Design an enzyme around this catalytic site. Structure first.
Site, PDB file in Angstrom:
ATOM      1  CE  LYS A 255       1.365   1.997   2.118  1.00 37.35           C
ATOM      2  NZ  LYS A 255       0.491   0.800   2.223  1.00 37.35           N
TER       3      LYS A 255
ATOM      4  CG  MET B 252       1.573   9.106  -8.403  1.00 35.20           C
ATOM      5  SD  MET B 252       2.385  10.570  -9.063  1.00 35.20           S
ATOM      6  CE  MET B 252       3.739   9.794  -9.946  1.00 35.20           C
TER       7      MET B 252
ATOM      8  CG  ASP C 107      11.988  -2.660  -1.746  1.00 38.67           C
ATOM      9  OD1 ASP C 107      12.607  -3.404  -2.536  1.00 38.67           O
ATOM     10  OD2 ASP C 107      10.782  -2.836  -1.466  1.00 38.67           O
TER      11      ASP C 107
ATOM     12  NE  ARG D  39       9.308  -4.620  -4.790  1.00 38.42           N
ATOM     13  CZ  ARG D  39      10.493  -5.156  -5.051  1.00 38.42           C
ATOM     14  NH1 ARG D  39      10.701  -5.781  -6.200  1.00 38.42           N
ATOM     15  NH2 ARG D  39      11.457  -5.104  -4.143  1.00 38.42           N
ATOM     16  CG  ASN D  40       8.798  -0.370  -4.033  1.00 38.50           C
ATOM     17  OD1 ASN D  40       7.675  -0.797  -3.762  1.00 38.50           O
ATOM     18  ND2 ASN D  40       9.908  -0.924  -3.558  1.00 38.50           N
TER      19      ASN D  40
ATOM     20  CG  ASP E 151       5.765   1.264  -0.878  1.00 38.00           C
ATOM     21  OD1 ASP E 151       6.761   0.726  -0.352  1.00 38.00           O
ATOM     22  OD2 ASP E 151       4.606   1.142  -0.423  1.00 38.00           O
TER      23      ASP E 151
HETATM   24  C1  LIG Z   1       0.651   6.261  -3.656  1.00 34.63           C
HETATM   25  C2  LIG Z   1      -0.026   6.199  -5.001  1.00 34.63           C
HETATM   26  C3  LIG Z   1      -0.470   5.082  -5.620  1.00 34.63           C
HETATM   27  C4  LIG Z   1      -1.028   5.466  -6.851  1.00 34.63           C
HETATM   28  N1  LIG Z   1      -1.609   4.619  -7.805  1.00 34.63           N
HETATM   29  C5  LIG Z   1      -2.335   5.052  -8.880  1.00 34.63           C
HETATM   30  C6  LIG Z   1      -2.756   4.008  -9.608  1.00 34.63           C
HETATM   31  S1  LIG Z   1      -3.723   4.157 -11.076  1.00 34.63           S
HETATM   32  O1  LIG Z   1      -3.237   5.348 -11.672  1.00 34.63           O
HETATM   33  O2  LIG Z   1      -5.069   4.073 -10.629  1.00 34.63           O
HETATM   34  C7  LIG Z   1      -3.302   2.741 -12.125  1.00 34.63           C
HETATM   35  C8  LIG Z   1      -4.421   1.686 -12.194  1.00 34.63           C
HETATM   36  O3  LIG Z   1      -4.120   1.630 -13.602  1.00 34.63           O
HETATM   37  C9  LIG Z   1      -3.578   2.966 -13.622  1.00 34.63           C
HETATM   38  C10 LIG Z   1      -2.250   2.797  -8.942  1.00 34.63           C
HETATM   39  C11 LIG Z   1      -2.330   1.417  -9.183  1.00 34.63           C
HETATM   40  C12 LIG Z   1      -1.711   0.556  -8.316  1.00 34.63           C
HETATM   41  C13 LIG Z   1      -1.020   1.072  -7.220  1.00 34.63           C
HETATM   42  N2  LIG Z   1      -0.389   0.212  -6.326  1.00 34.63           N
HETATM   43  C14 LIG Z   1       0.050   0.714  -5.021  1.00 34.63           C
HETATM   44  C15 LIG Z   1       0.140  -0.447  -4.030  1.00 34.63           C
HETATM   45  C16 LIG Z   1       1.397   1.369  -5.176  1.00 34.63           C
HETATM   46  C17 LIG Z   1       1.861   2.235  -4.202  1.00 34.63           C
HETATM   47  C18 LIG Z   1       3.103   2.826  -4.369  1.00 34.63           C
HETATM   48  C19 LIG Z   1       3.830   2.524  -5.513  1.00 34.63           C
HETATM   49  F1  LIG Z   1       5.044   3.075  -5.719  1.00 34.63           F
HETATM   50  C20 LIG Z   1       3.298   1.648  -6.443  1.00 34.63           C
HETATM   51  N3  LIG Z   1       2.114   1.106  -6.248  1.00 34.63           N
HETATM   52  N4  LIG Z   1      -0.955   2.371  -7.003  1.00 34.63           N
HETATM   53  C21 LIG Z   1      -1.536   3.246  -7.813  1.00 34.63           C
HETATM   54  N5  LIG Z   1      -0.919   6.768  -6.958  1.00 34.63           N
HETATM   55  N6  LIG Z   1      -0.288   7.250  -5.806  1.00 34.63           N
END
Ligand SMILES: Cc1cc(-n2cc(S(=O)(=O)C3COC3)c3ccc(N[C@@H](C)c4ccc(F)cn4)nc32)n[nH]1
Length: 279
Positions: free
Chosen positions: A41, A90, A140, A144-145, A161
């Site tokens: 991040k 993840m 929150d 989405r988180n 998040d």
């Molecule tokens: C901290 C972290 C994030 C993460 N991550 C792994 C993928 S992925 O596995 O590449 C997926 C692509 O299609 C398979 C992924 C996709 C979007 C994403 N958005 C961010 C803004 C987010 C951050 C925190 C949250 F709770 C939700 N979203 N974060 C992803 N892994 N670890």
């Protein structure tokens, strides 16, 4: 185990050992530590001093959690720009996208089952019990988180998040109980309400809460006593957990220990887990 730490306690990973690969989203890159896959991040180099403390503080809090349903902090690169927080990758992605994309469809039916939804709910409830037991209010809780370790069986859901809790240390009205959005009162019971909304999110398979209402419509609706209907095909025992989560007085809402047990009862009732998901 509150904020009995400072920047100095964070694991600084030398910048030359970090590789940025591909972008994942906004609001973050897939990365490599030299080996080892991470999420990175980033703090935009273009930012105010307030932003900088916000970034730093989020790193500190996430570094201090130790729980299997909370994304791990691998380390930090704060001494080089742009600053990095390195977090557990993840592969299952965010919970919202997963539900929307794994909705049973004619070609791929029985993709997801009720029990799989219950396990995600348990996972996140388990993380929330840990936050509550350590006197941390998330503010929150929402699909989405949340993140999933992988797509298939054996996936683990984790809270991934902490941006809003970090901000008060726009508003997600559709996930906030009356006492939060009316008074700015936050307690462990405000997370309980949000968990109910998340629960609705899970069993609707990634629908937006209050689907046809604006924020103000929701605010008036929730204040007047209105609550969401059950998601399509949602078992009664599960909806009752949602409705107990949305009790008007926080003191009448369950804590997360009680919620977990109730999800587990749901997990060992055949009429619940044999209910087919809508396609
Ligand atoms: C901290 C972290 C994030 C993460 N991550 C792994 C993928 S992925 O596995 O590449 C997926 C692509 O299609 C398979 C992924 C996709 C979007 C994403 N958005 C961010 C803004 C987010 C951050 C925190 C949250 F709770 C939700 N979203 N974060 C992803 N892994 N670890």
């Amino acid at each position: 185990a509150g904020k009995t730490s400072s920047i100095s306690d964070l694991k600084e990973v030398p910048r030359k050992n970090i590789t940025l690969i591909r972008g994942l989203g906004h609001g973050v890159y897939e990365g490599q530590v030299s080996p080892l896959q991470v999420a990175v991040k980033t703090l935009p180099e273009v930012c105010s001093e307030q932003d900088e403390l916000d970034f730093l503080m989020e790193a500190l809090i996430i570094s201090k959690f130790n729980h299997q349903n909370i994304v791990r902090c691998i380390g930090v690169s704060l001494q080089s720009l742009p600053r990095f927080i390195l977090l557990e990758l993840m592969a299952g992605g965010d919970l919202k996208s997963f539900l929307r994309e794994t909705r049973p469809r004619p070609s791929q039916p029985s993709s997801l089952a009720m029990l799989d939804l219950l396990h995600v709910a348990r996972d996140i409830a388990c993380g929330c019990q840990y936050l509550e037991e350590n006197h941390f209010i998330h503010r929150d809780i929402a699909a989405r988180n949340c993140l999933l370790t992988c797509p298939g069986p054996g996936r683990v859901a984790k809270i991934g998040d902490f941006g809003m809790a970090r901000d008060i240390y726009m508003l997600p009205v559709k996930w906030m109980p009356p006492e939060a959005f009316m008074e700015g009162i936050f307690t462990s019971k405000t997370d309980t309400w949000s968990f109910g909304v998340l629960l609705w999110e899970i069993f609707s398979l990634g629908y937006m809460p209050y689907p046809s209402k604006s924020n103000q419509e929701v605010l008036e609706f929730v204040t007047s006593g209105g609550r969401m209907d059950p998601p399509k095909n949602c078992p009664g025992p599960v909806y009752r957990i949602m409705t107990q989560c949305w009790q008007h007085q926080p003191e009448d809402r369950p804590n997360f220990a009680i919620i977990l047990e109730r999800i587990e009862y749901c997990t060992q009732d055949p009429d619940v887990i044999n209910t087919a998901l809508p396609i």
